[PDB]
Amino acid sequence: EKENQDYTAVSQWQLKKFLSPIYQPEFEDWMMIILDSMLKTKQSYLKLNSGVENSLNGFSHLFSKPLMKRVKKLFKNQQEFILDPQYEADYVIPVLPGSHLNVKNPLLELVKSLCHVMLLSKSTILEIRT
Amino acid sequence: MYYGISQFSEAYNKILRNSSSHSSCQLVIFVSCLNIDALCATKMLSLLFKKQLVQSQIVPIFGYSELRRHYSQLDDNINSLLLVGFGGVIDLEAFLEIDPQEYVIDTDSGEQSFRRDIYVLDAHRPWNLDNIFGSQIIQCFDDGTVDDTLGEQKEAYYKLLELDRKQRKKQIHEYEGVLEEYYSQGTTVVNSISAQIYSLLSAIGETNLSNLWLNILGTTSLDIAYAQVYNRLYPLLQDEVKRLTPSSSVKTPDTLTLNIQPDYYLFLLRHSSLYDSFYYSNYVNAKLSLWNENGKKRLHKMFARMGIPLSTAQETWLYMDHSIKRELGIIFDKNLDRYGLQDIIRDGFVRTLGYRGSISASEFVEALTALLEVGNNSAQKLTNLRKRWVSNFWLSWDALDDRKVELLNRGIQLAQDLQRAIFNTGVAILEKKLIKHLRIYRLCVLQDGPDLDLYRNPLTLLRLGNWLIECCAESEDKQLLPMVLASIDENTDTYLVAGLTPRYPRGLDKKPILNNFSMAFQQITAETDAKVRIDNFESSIIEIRREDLSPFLEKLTLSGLL
Numbered sequence: 001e002k003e004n005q006d007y008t009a010v011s012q013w014q015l016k017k018f019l020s021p022i023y024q025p026e027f028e029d030w031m032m033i034i035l036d037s038m039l040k041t042k043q044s045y046l047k048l049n050s051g052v053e054n055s056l057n058g059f060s061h062l063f064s065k066p067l068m069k070r071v072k073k074l075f076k077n078q079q080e081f082i083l084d085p086q087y088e089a090d091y092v093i094p095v096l097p098g099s100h101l102n103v104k105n106p107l108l109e110l111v112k113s114l115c116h117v118m119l120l121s122k123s124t125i126l127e128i129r130t
Numbered sequence: 131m132y133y134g135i136s137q138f139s140e141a142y143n144k145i146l147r148n149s150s151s152h153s154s155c156q157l158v159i160f161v162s163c164l165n166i167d168a169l170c171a172t173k174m175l176s177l178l179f180k181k182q183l184v185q186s187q188i189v190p191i192f193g194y195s196e197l198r199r200h201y202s203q204l205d206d207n208i209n210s211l212l213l214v215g216f217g218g219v220i221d222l223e224a225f226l227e228i229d230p231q232e233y234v235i236d237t238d239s240g241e242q243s244f245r246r247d248i249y250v251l252d253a254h255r256p257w258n259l260d261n262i263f264g265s266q267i268i269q270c271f272d273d274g275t276v277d278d279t280l281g282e283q284k285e286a287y288y289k290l291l292e293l294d295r296k297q298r299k300k301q302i303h304e305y306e307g308v309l310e311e312y313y314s315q316g317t318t319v320v321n322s323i324s325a326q327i328y329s330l331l332s333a334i335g336e337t338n339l340s341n342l343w344l345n346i347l348g349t350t351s352l353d354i355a356y357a358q359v360y361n362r363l364y365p366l367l368q369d370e371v372k373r374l375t376p377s378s379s380v381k382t383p384d385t386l387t388l389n390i391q392p393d394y395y396l397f398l399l400r401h402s403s404l405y406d407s408f409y410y411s412n413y414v415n416a417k418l419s420l421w422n423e424n425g426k427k428r429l430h431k432m433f434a435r436m437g438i439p440l441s442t443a444q445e446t447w448l449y450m451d452h453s454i455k456r457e458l459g460i461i462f463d464k465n466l467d468r469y470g471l472q473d474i475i476r477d478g479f480v481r482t483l484g485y486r487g488s489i490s491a492s493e494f495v496e497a498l499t500a501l502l503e504v505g506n507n508s509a510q511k512l513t514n515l516r517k518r519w520v521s522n523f524w525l526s527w528d529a530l531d532d533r534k535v536e537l538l539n540r541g542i543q544l545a546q547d548l549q550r551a552i553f554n555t556g557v558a559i560l561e562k563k564l565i566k567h568l569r570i571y572r573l574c575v576l577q578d579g580p581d582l583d584l585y586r587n588p589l590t591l592l593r594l595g596n597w598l599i600e601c602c603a604e605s606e607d608k609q610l611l612p613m614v615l616a617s618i619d620e621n622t623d624t625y626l627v628a629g630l631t632p633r634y635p636r637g638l639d640k641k642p643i644l645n646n647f648s649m650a651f652q653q654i655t656a657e658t659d660a661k662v663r664i665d666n667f668e669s670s671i672i673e674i675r676r677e678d679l680s681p682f683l684e685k686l687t688l689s690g691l692l
Contacts, residue, residue, distance in 0.1 A: 083658040083681045104677045 020106045022090035037062040053123040131276045139333035148209040155185035162215030163190035163523040170348035171323040190523045193665035211248040216667040218252025253319045259287045273321040283312045316644020324348025350491035386483035393478025393490045401542045405443040410549045416600040421557045436465045497541035501526035556597045576617045585617035595630040625679045629670030650691045
């Protein structure tokens with residue numbers, strides 16, 4: 001019997017380990033942002049409606065505007081320090097026993113992973129596709 | 131400096147004193163393949179060594195690593211090496227790990243001799259100062275720019291090497307500043323290899339009509355991007371043609387003649403239609419802007435004004451009615467001034483023999499260039515592809531012979547097809563506006579298009595590049611800018627990047643512009659970890675991966691050495 005209900009957030013992505021070490025904590029950061037926006041959208045929809053698509057439709061209007069700017073800033077940082085030997089140690093790909101693919105752009109792989117975990121929604125797949 | 135022109139003959143004598151032996155082969159000529167000038171130069175050298183019986187091994191080389199592989203496997207019996215078309219920019223001791231201590235024989239008295247001679251026949255005017263001055267083993271066939279221009283650098287290098295506080299810093303840093311001002315300078319050509327070897331043949335006395343024709347081809351092949359060189363070397367060729375011509379006649383099957391006659395600045399005039407010659411010419415599309423539909427309308431309108439019907443103009447030149455082609459000079463003089471095509475009028479060299487037709491020098495060198503181009507896990511593909519262009523080079527060498535005119539006609543047809551592909555991809559670039567302005571250089575990246583597998587060849591990409599520079603040079607609204615031309619290869623998955631210098635319009639008549647892409651390419655390769663290939667003899671030709679292309683261009687536009 002708690003207003004916060006003693007909720008906790010669990011993130012157990014093994015997808016994060018197939019990324020460069022600079023780009024690993026940003027994946028968890030954006031997953032936390034996605035989770036918080038999804039809870040806020042679900043609460044707003046539930047409070048509005050109660051007084052095929054789920055409660056989660058339209059959740060990406062809350063955070064697409066920071067995300068486009070963040071991806072563009074990360075792209076500007078990407079086109080400077082990938083070939084520089086000082087910052088290349090953060091940009092390497094790790095070798096894992098499950099890995100079979102080869103990365104070509106780490107930011108492309110991060111954007112694909114984020115859009116694929118956002119793409120698992122069966123309801124708002126059109127908006128996530130846009 | 132080590133060989134001025136008046137002692138080229140002496141250098142050849144030294145070659146005889148190392149190679150005129152019937153028992154063994156001792157002379158190996160390293161030729162830069164994919165170059166018309168080196169091809170004609172090695173043809174004249176091979177004729178000269180065939181007439182005097184010198185054993186030879188002619189080896190075509192594409193890359194610098196290919197040079198290092200071929201020089202590493204050379205036998206110690208070889209004492210004469212000729213480097214044709216390359217070897218004038220890099221340091222050959224630092225590249226071929228050359229140390230004079232294990233190559234010296236009979237040092238005793240201030241005399242030094244070596245067991246191997248390496249001669250350089252290079253047209254790239256940035257000359258390495260160690261190579262030209264401090265090297266005994268590497269012998270340069272200099273045009274004469276060392277006696278006029280490179281004297282301050284000579285004394286700076288000599289007091290740098292001789293003298294191994296404020297006085298020492300004040301003179302040594304000044305001489306190093308002079309040397310580093312001579313270095314980091316762009317690449318240019320002012321003389322052809324064929325002219326230097328024909329000067330050697332004039333010094334010896336083995337000149338004839340065939341060597342003169344090969345010299346004419348070697349000089350004419352530089353008329354695309356180095357027209358000042360051709361305009362400088364034209365009166366010497368005129369004097370030689372009027373010297374070695376016979377007294378006079380009737381057309382007979384044995385009399386080869388080589389006339390100085392009007393040879394207009396057209397693509398394949400005597401082996402195609404007049405409509406296709408004006409339509410596929412770089413200068414005509416450069417001025418009248420034939421890439422859009424208005425240029426084609428203007429070309430048809432000037433065909434109406436010249437009085438040539440399109441049925442007659444599209445007919446083959448050999449089957450053309452000669453009421454059009456006999457007074458074509460008068461028609462050109464009367465009609466081309468209103469459309470701005472006055473510079474089509476140009477006197478060139480036309481050779482014919484027997485009854486098999488006339489060939490110009492320009493048509494012959496485009497046929498030879500086409501026979502270089504399309505004449506016939508990734509590292510195996512690159513090795514097979516380098517072997518393919520070496521086979522193309524030897525096919526073009528086979529086309530240089532008089533008895534193999536079928537190879538020449540195959541080269542003519544290949545030149546027509548390749549110019550059709552170049553025209554289609556050029557209007558593909560111009561219609562959708564892939565040329566981007568980057569305020570210091572102009573960028574053109576080919577991602578996809580018609581028959582993109584022809585652009586893994588260097589000279590085909592240079593043909594497209596010269597097409598773009600000629601088309602953009604006559605447009606005065608955008609000023610002179612260097613061009614980056616990148617073409618993608620999907621199977622190799624590499625962007626082959628070419629650096630193209632701009633040029634002034636052909637009608638104007640000064641100091642030639644330099645090629646500042648090699649300095650930036652070397653500095654970005656040194657500073658960054660880009661996996662790139664620098665091995666091409668033309669240093670503006672590099673290969674980048676697809677994923678490393680955009681950081682390379684960002685570091686290129688950040689660098690101010692363009």
